[PDB]
Amino acid sequence: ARPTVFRWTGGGKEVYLSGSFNNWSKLPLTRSQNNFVAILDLPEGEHQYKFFVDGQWTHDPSEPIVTSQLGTVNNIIQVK
Numbered sequence: 001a002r003p004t005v006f007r008w009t010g011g012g013k014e015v016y017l018s019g020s021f022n023n024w025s026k027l028p029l030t031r032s033q034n035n036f037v038a039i040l041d042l043p044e045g046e047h048q049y050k051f052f053v054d055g056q057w058t059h060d061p062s063e064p065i066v067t068s069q070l071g072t073v074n075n076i077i078q079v080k
């Protein structure tokens, strides 16, 4: 059982993490270096997420994405 590192390297000033794991609320990320990071204990399974970056909903382009039932694009983590 192992925590998941969320690391936004896309730049910006104020970044929050949102996802199924927090009912799409906003977790403010702490800036380390030029990046923004959180560590979450996510259980086994699938978890959709997105970033809110300087007032804009945004996904990480390097990471897996899926289209939601809302027609919106989320990143996705799968924990074994």
Ligand SMILES: OC[C@H]1O[C@@H]2O[C@H]3[C@H](O)[C@@H](O)[C@@H](O[C@H]4[C@H](O)[C@@H](O)[C@@H](O[C@H]5[C@H](O)[C@@H](O)[C@@H](O[C@H]6[C@H](O)[C@@H](O)[C@@H](O[C@H]7[C@H](O)[C@@H](O)[C@@H](O[C@H]8[C@H](O)[C@@H](O)[C@@H](O[C@H]1[C@H](O)[C@H]2O)O[C@@H]8CO)O[C@@H]7CO)O[C@@H]6CO)O[C@@H]5CO)O[C@@H]4CO)O[C@@H]3CO
Pocket (backbone or CB within 6 Å): 024, 050, 057, 068, 069, 070, 071, 072, 073, 074
């Ligand atoms: O809030 C939870 C939600 O968070 C994240 O979503 C954000 C998203 O990432 C941002 O991009 C932005 O969304 C904007 C979007 O980009 C714009 O295109 C626009 O959206 C309009 C739609 O394009 C338009 O089609 C219409 O939408 C209607 C749907 O088509 C219709 O199906 C229905 O939608 C309902 C869903 O079918 C149902 O499943 C349920 O939706 C839930 C999602 O399935 C679930 O994943 C989660 O959603 C996340 C999302 O995945 C994240 O990316 O919870 C959802 C809510 O419970 O309920 C839907 C109805 O609530 O009805 C809609 C509305 O008629 O209109 C929309 C509005 O114009 O506008 C967006 C800006 O608001 O922001 C969202 C956060 O709001």
